[PDB]
Amino acid sequence: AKKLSPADKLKNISSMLEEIVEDTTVPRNIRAAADNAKNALHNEEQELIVRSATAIQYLDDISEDPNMPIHTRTQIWGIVSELETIKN
Amino acid sequence: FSAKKLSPADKLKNISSMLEEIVEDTTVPRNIRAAADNAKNALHNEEQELIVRSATAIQYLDDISEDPNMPIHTRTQIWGIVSELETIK
């Protein structure tokens, strides 16, 4: 009857982020934004909800970019929605 | 200004597609696959407004989440679908 642990959620989100970072079809700056978001989630000086908010902001900032591929936008939406579920 | 975002239509499409993935997934208990189809059809219940349909779909998935037989991969897929359903407003 396992629920998903905070560690598992962060690992899943980070993998979704690395999927964008490694999608060499994606513009450099968007890949950079996803890696910043990814690194934000591993800031050990912050608790999870503060890391999550930080990562959300890096992702919202880039969502404003004119050359984002349709597939990447759907991906970011999923990552952000998952980030917003993180509580405690 | 509102942010560049997916349309509600596109969110629903993407959620339905993710649900269909579990439905067609043979490694999943039939009851959990049926729950994911139930959730998917709940989204197209044009009898209700979007908030209620989303919640109904979430409810199907939350009810089946307490199933001890659920595979790890499916649990992650459902967390993603629920998260996205929760943004439907």
Side-chain angles (χ1 to χ4, degrees), chain A residues 1 4-88, chain B residues 3 5-89:
Chain A
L4 268 178
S5 77
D8 291 357
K9 286 170 171 179
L10 202 76
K11 166 186 187 59
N12 286 321
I13 294 162
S14 295
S15 299
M16 273 160 101
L17 285 164
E18 184 66 8
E19 184 167 1
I20 298 169
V21 178
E22 288 191 63
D23 197 17
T24 187
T25 207
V26 180
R28 191 164 151 89
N29 70 311
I30 296 160
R31 299 188 340 247
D35 213 32
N36 295 335
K38 181 188 109 165
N39 296 330
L41 293 185
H42 300 264
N43 188 340
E44 292 162 346
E45 296 324 283
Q46 291 171 341
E47 292 178 56
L48 194 48
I49 71 173
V50 175
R51 302 188 210 182
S52 297
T54 299
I56 290 167
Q57 186 61 35
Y58 274 122
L59 300 171
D60 294 350
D61 280 353
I62 205 66
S63 287
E64 295 310 329
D65 196 276
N67 297 78
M68 193 172 287
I70 281 84
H71 71 271
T72 308
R73 191 169 295 288
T74 296
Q75 283 173 326
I76 293 171
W77 167 62
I79 292 169
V80 168
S81 306
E82 283 175 355
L83 286 167
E84 293 166 334
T85 69
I86 289 170
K87 293 167 172 39
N88 269 55
Chain B
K5 56 195 172 155
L6 312 156
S7 63
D10 275 338
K11 299 181 180 193
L12 290 187
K13 194 210 268 263
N14 272 290
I15 290 162
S16 311
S17 145
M18 277 173 283
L19 283 167
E20 194 51 42
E21 195 171 8
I22 301 173
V23 171
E24 301 181 23
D25 184 345
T26 61
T27 60
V28 187
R30 294 192 87 98
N31 71 305
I32 293 155
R33 299 171 64 185
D37 214 30
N38 292 344
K40 189 185 140 181
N41 294 317
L43 290 177
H44 299 82
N45 186 5
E46 287 195 328
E47 193 184 46
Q48 306 165 327
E49 309 175 31
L50 258 178
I51 303 315
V52 179
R53 297 180 204 136
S54 299
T56 306
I58 289 167
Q59 194 93 75
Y60 277 114
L61 293 172
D62 280 359
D63 289 12
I64 211 82
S65 83
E66 215 76 27
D67 206 273
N69 255 24
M70 206 197 277
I72 297 182
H73 78 283
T74 314
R75 190 178 296 287
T76 289
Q77 288 167 356
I78 289 159
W79 169 55
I81 297 159
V82 167
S83 299
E84 293 170 11
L85 279 163
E86 293 183 317
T87 72
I88 303 307
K89 70 167 181 156

